[PDB]
Design a protein around this ligand. Structure first.
Ligand SMILES: C[C@H](CCC(=O)NCCC[N+](C)(C)CCCS(=O)(=O)[O-])[C@H]1CC[C@H]2[C@H]3[C@H](O)C[C@@H]4C[C@H](O)CC[C@]4(C)[C@H]3C[C@H](O)[C@]12C
Ligand SMILES: C[C@H](CCC(=O)NCCC[N+](C)(C)CCCS(=O)(=O)[O-])[C@H]1CC[C@H]2[C@H]3[C@H](O)C[C@@H]4C[C@H](O)CC[C@]4(C)[C@H]3C[C@H](O)[C@]12C
Ligand SMILES: C[C@H](CCC(=O)NCCC[N+](C)(C)CCCS(=O)(=O)[O-])[C@H]1CC[C@H]2[C@H]3[C@H](O)C[C@@H]4C[C@H](O)CC[C@]4(C)[C@H]3C[C@H](O)[C@]12C
Ligand SMILES: C[C@H](CCC(=O)NCCC[N+](C)(C)CCCS(=O)(=O)[O-])[C@H]1CC[C@H]2[C@H]3[C@H](O)C[C@@H]4C[C@H](O)CC[C@]4(C)[C@H]3C[C@H](O)[C@]12C
Ligand SMILES: C[C@H](CCC(=O)NCCC[N+](C)(C)CCCS(=O)(=O)[O-])[C@H]1CC[C@H]2[C@H]3[C@H](O)C[C@@H]4C[C@H](O)CC[C@]4(C)[C@H]3C[C@H](O)[C@]12C
Ligand SMILES: *[C@@H]1O[C@H](CO)[C@@H](O)[C@H](O)[C@H]1NC(C)=O
Ligand SMILES: *[C@@H]1O[C@H](CO)[C@@H](O)[C@H](O)[C@H]1NC(C)=O
Ligand SMILES: *[C@@H]1O[C@H](CO)[C@@H](O)[C@H](O)[C@H]1NC(C)=O
Ligand SMILES: *[C@@H]1O[C@H](CO)[C@@H](O)[C@H](O)[C@H]1NC(C)=O
Ligand SMILES: *[C@@H]1O[C@H](CO)[C@@H](O)[C@H](O)[C@H]1NC(C)=O
Ligand code: NA
Ligand code: NA
Lengths: 320, 320, 320, 320, 320
């Protein structure tokens, strides 16, 4: 008879998966949750959904599952499936997936003192508010919320593990990630019933360099072409074709931006404002060309276009 | 021996998951359902499908699961998995997903008086009739239906929880949400068999600002260019190229709208009507230019185009 | 002791889920199936797959599950999970999804006489042959097949419920739906082994109005422009640019149609034929323009183009 | 007491789902597998994945599950769920889906002699090598492999059912399907351990007619326009615009082909070669036009273009 | 009574699925893992995710499951479901899918000596760092990591099977695959707790030929057209239209590249740099043309363009 099998049989002789591990009803169970983010899978701005891959550390004491190590040949720790032992109900409150199931959560560690540890590796797809006021490059703070959904603070008191809680670098594909300090706070949706929760913040700064040559370069080139457009002679039979080419190009760029850029509700993106400015400027330039004393009007239009361009550039540097 | 484990064993000594919690066959079970919508995930107009993330509150009395709190060390409430206790069959009648399963519905609260509470967090993807008569910005009322699918009113009588039933703001990404008062009504698909149901209305008003610069700005610019087109001299060798550019631009815009706009059956969108108007106007302008006394005909065509444009603008303001 | 629990225990004292409810091997079990379609979710022509949301009514007699109502306090009907009682194996033979599972099929009704009823709400994604000979607007008959997959007629004899079998309107987004009468017929894949099946027909007529302005309007406008093209003077230095614009526009329309229209195998769509006609006509017009006594040749080409256009229009009205 | 229930209880009094139905360890179990393909769902060339809908016939003898029919009221055959009786492990070796589960495989037939039959309807999404050397229309042979994954030939000897094994037509949407004769062969990944497998071939010939007007018609029209291009006078101020239009059109066609055509590794498609040829020809024509004794050079260029076009046409007919 | 059934009953008389197969707590269990990759399904650069189809070989000794073959009629090996026998927890640490479940892992081999073998066929979708510094054709080394997630080295010591560990060819669709030697190394996330892991490297070199004609050919043709552009006479009334055509073509190519090319963060692709160079060159050429002693300036611009083109070509050959 194996000692480990005997210990497992004795420990779980009469155990249920729906009994809170507390010796008395008055007593409470302490659960420490640590959210570690390893890799940032992606962040869809159209859906405002951040997908990341990282494991979560759960630690809770248990008055049961306790044995003297010397009795069982000096055994220290054991591995037990999560199904049998009691499992605290911790769920991401801002979860976005249809179902919330850990990819690898079939094992947990039990010590002789009763400190039950769980490290279920999981893929977290959560919601995050994105501020797209400036979109050459942005940096948003996304908060992941953990805690019980039906256990009040009087039953389980979620906490944090201060050990090894120092800030450290997070691997990212095109986003530089900084791990913010985690905090805890209580929601109160009913009198005499407060539910604790842990909020962990992650600050992501965009580092992609392709967006500069896909969203800014064509727009600035179209603006430069529109600026050069008034220099064409009115009677050269080329202003109309040049304006048609500019309008087709800016329409194509607008279509590409609509296909790529999301439908932000708060504020229009700076790229969208630049595209609208180039659209209106090319339209007015085409109107002046088709209408065409004339030299002074053309000079005034060129000056207005130049001042608009310099204002746009200084604003871009201001939000750069 | 833990008191909680003893209470759980005694309560569920002989209990089935298919027995309605009623003391007599004549008696009925009252179930109160409250539908709370937290965030509006999205609303696809092409599929007419509204996806939202919100929890649902179920409250039903049970003659079983009753105990004296003083006996079990003054215990007040307990947490039990939904699998063991009886679960009322409440399903969204207008559900759109292949399967209807709550993301987090593995726990429920049982009080000493027997009032069983359930708060299964779920992601509801339902159907909603969308009126796209005016599409610069719309506001539709979407109704979510809850209730039993095989339990008649004689078995379970769905109701509403008037407590804290006041209207309140709902978080939204690009839609402003107002929570309508919920009502109840009975379907009758067979004589002597009426099934109750709860209908909750949500009024969503669009707040996206990008659609103005992606659907209206290019169309109005093309219309303005078409208006300016007749001013070109007939013999300037530029009307044909200008018309070709306009037709290419409007064709590209039509392609973009077809890729973006859904295939509405009721009425054509106002943007589609505007695009058709600009198409026909540019076509007739190109025909007049290629055909080209002439001055009076051109003036009449310009007047007709101007009156059409002013009628379109006044209609747009009317539905604005 | 609750009467309902006692009745449920007595009825299912020794019951299996793999035993056909028949008193003798010679006897057979009658199953009545009614397929009701509530909403037509969509119909993808590229995959030829029709997705609909509707419930299915199953009614089968059972010599077991029978009790005297007076004994159990006059109880009339009971609700039982589908897992315990025997379930006839009815599956859509033309099913297209990877798995065939009802969304809400966890409950069934049992009467005192033994008439077991089941109403599992389900989402049916089936195959349908689409005739795309005429595609301004079409109307196809799609057949849904129900029945056993391994139960022969000697075991289960599928039938129809003539009660309330009258034709009625079906809700649709962009398709008008008519419910055809359902029939039954027997497949014979082996001698002395015939399997019954129920075929229900649904006639869907397209009602979308956006396809007229996305598939027909640009094509007819390009055809009109090509018709007007020969009127341009040969020496005006504008025929070549006009032809280039027309060819670019028709190429863009062809790309849009390829992205939208499926790859039909039977016959080419009428829109595709119209696009091919406009392509060849614009190509020949460009060839004649570049080649350019000349007046008579141009008049003959214009006459041929006009007769081709009138033939196309009369054919379109014929299939309209 | 029902006779069928008594027979089912007696047959499965002590039965396991992990015991091979063999009376002795030396003896082996014969399994006959027949792969029948009903409909070809699709064949994605980009992923090289063929999805089809067809049922599979399994027949294996069992020394258990045997009874005298006369004892049980002359019962002949019974239906039993696949979970209880032993199930041979037959899996498509070239399966492409994440999971391999039959859609409807919950029932099987047991005869009095012990011949266990199984007809699990399934949707097979397998891999197939596609030869895209000629892509106006192709015809590939796709092989589906069935057999055990951990059972050697010494345990289960897969075979074929020669009865009704004649070639017959297979329904297809846009592919004509011919059922090839199935064969068996043994893999040997370890000495003294050979695993049998059944390979069934299906020959599919493309029948789509839309690809001719979406991939060949625009290319041939662009080639014809490029051929006509040299006839334009050098000083007509139209060669440059015509070349620009041709290059824009061929670029759009290349974009469409890239979006549609997959990234074949073996050989470039014939359509891609034709597009490259038209690209290079239009580029050289534009270079000659911009550079522009001249008449002889233009005649030589026209002759070279004509000979290249005739070579391309004869090659196309050769692979046609 | 079948001998095999008796052996299976005797072996698993009292066995648990959560007991490590070790005779003593001090002793450890050796597990040998071999990762074999058969086919490379694909490698998405946008997500940096490599999907492959290959089986994994697990071999672990067991002090239990041991019997004398002579007793049970000389039986050598048996097949047992993975559910009953103990299963080592081996999971891909860099897994990308939501869930990690083997497609076919329902069987395992048990020998008389106790050497338990498992060959669960699986589809591995892992993460891989992609170096896109040069993108005419690349070759990346992707590492797959296997090992325990909660078992330390003191419990299970993962190793490698040196038998038949020679390098061999791997089938690929458009990637040539070389199998690198596998190694083992230990992670240490806590003192006195080291977890072993096996890293297997696969070197993939791109072999697709379509990317040359979709990403390089249009870019080089546009560059050649831009080079030829300065040769146009300033007063020919064709420089403006030629520049408009070039800018439209390069904008379309940029849109296609943005739709196809991923958003790399490390370095911009060489194709993107080439497109930016052609954009800036065509813009400056258009500026010089519109501005237009002049001959010397045009010659200097042509020389600068030629030297830039030759530098780009020599760099491309350097990274070719
Ligand atoms: C609803 C949950 C509260 C969960 C909790 O931890 N405790 C109370 C739960 C009580 N129950 C519902 C179980 C019982 C109800 C009893 S009742 O009487 O109602 O039936 C809270 C916790 C975190 C909250 C938000 C995120 O942070 C950030 C975010 C940014 C936005 O711009 C708006 C959207 C969003 C996603 C917010 C939505 C919502 O606000 C959340 C999910
Ligand atoms: C069919 C269900 C009724 C469910 C119910 O709550 N009670 C009766 C069910 C009785 N069973 C079927 C179980 C037994 C049949 C016995 S039988 O004798 O038939 O076999 C009812 C309840 C809500 C209804 C609609 C939505 O509101 C709004 C909506 C807008 C449209 O523009 C048309 C589409 C849509 C989705 C409507 C469809 C349908 O109309 C629904 C789903
Ligand atoms: C294959 C099933 C028959 C199912 C049935 O109801 N009864 C016999 C089954 C017998 N089993 C296979 C179980 C045992 C074989 C014994 S064996 O000796 O073979 O091993 C029959 C029933 C309905 C049939 C079609 C649809 O209507 C319409 C349709 C339009 C097309 O243009 C071609 C495609 C399609 C989808 C057709 C395919 C096929 O034709 C179907 C699925
Ligand atoms: C790997 C399986 C063999 C399965 C089998 O039926 N028997 C041996 C299995 C032995 N096990 C792995 C279970 C134990 C290993 C013991 S070990 O000592 O290794 O640990 C064989 C059977 C069929 C084979 C291919 C297809 O036909 C056609 C195809 C066309 C291509 O262009 C290249 C890709 C592809 C998909 C091929 C891949 C592979 O080649 C397959 C899946
Ligand atoms: C996190 C795992 C370690 C797993 C392991 O094998 N052993 C330790 C696990 C210990 N647990 C978490 C279970 C307990 C924690 C105790 S605690 O006290 O924290 O609660 C390690 C093993 C392999 C690692 C990477 C890949 O190779 C390559 C790769 C390329 C990039 O450019 C950055 C991204 C990426 C995907 C890396 C991420 C991460 O780095 C991985 C997944
Ligand atoms: C919960 O734990 C926190 C420690 O962060 C402590 O401050 C608080 O008093 C605890 N509350 C209860 C009810 O135990
Ligand atoms: C159901 O509850 C409602 C309360 O909203 C009540 O008006 C109605 O009479 C009840 N019906 C039955 C049958 O209990
Ligand atoms: C099956 O039911 C039909 C009723 O539609 C009947 O005509 C037929 O005779 C029945 N067949 C058997 C074998 O019971
Ligand atoms: C397996 O069956 C085939 C029949 O196709 C037979 O030729 C072969 O000898 C059999 N092998 C064994 C080991 O039974
Ligand atoms: C684990 O196995 C390796 C063999 O690769 C061996 O070198 C090492 O010492 C072993 N460690 C333990 C703790 O058994
Ligand atoms: Na043009
Ligand atoms: Na164009």
């Amino acid at each position: 008879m194996a000692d480990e099998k005997r210990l497992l049989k004795c420990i779980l002789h009469d155990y249920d998966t729906a009994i809170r591990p507390v010796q008395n009803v008055s007593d409470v169970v302490n659960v420490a949750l640590e959210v570690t983010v390893v890799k940032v899978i992606d962040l869809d701005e159209k859906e405002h959904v951040l997908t990341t891959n990282g494991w979560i550390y759960h630690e809770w004491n248990d008055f049961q599952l306790k044995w003297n190590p010397s009795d069982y040949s000096g055994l220290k720790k054991i591995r037990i499936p999560v199904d049998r032992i009691w499992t605290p109900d911790i769920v991401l409150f801002n979860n976005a997936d249809e179902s919330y199931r850990y990819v690898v959560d079939k094992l947990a560690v039990v010590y002789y003192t009763g400190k039950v540890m769980w490290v279920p590796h999981a893929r977290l797809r959560s919601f995050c508010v994105l501020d797209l006021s400036r979109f050459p490059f942005d940096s948003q703070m996304c908060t992941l919320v953990f805690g019980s959904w039906t256990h009040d603070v009087s039953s389980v008191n979620v906490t944090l593990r201060n050990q090894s809680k120092v800030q450290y670098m997070i691997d990212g594909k095109e986003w530089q990630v900084t791990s913010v300090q985690p905090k805890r706070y209580q929601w109160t949706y009913n009198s005499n019933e407060n539910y604790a929760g842990i909020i962990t913040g992650i600050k992501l700064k965009r580092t992609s360099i392709y967006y500069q040559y896909v969203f800014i370069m064509p727009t600035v080139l179209l603006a430069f072409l529109t600026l050069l457009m008034p220099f064409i002679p009115p009677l050269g039979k080329e202003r109309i074709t040049y304006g048609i080419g500019l309008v087709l190009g800016c329409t194509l760029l607008l279509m590409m931006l609509s296909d790529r850029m999301p439908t932000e509700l708060g504020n229009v993106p700076v790229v969208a404002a630049y595209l609208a400015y180039v659209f209106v400027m090319v339209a007015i330039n085409l109107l002046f060309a088709i209408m065409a004393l004339t030299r002074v009007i053309d000079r005034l239009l060129f000056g207005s276009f130049l001042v608009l361009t310099v204002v746009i550039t200084i604003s871009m540097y201001a939000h750069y």
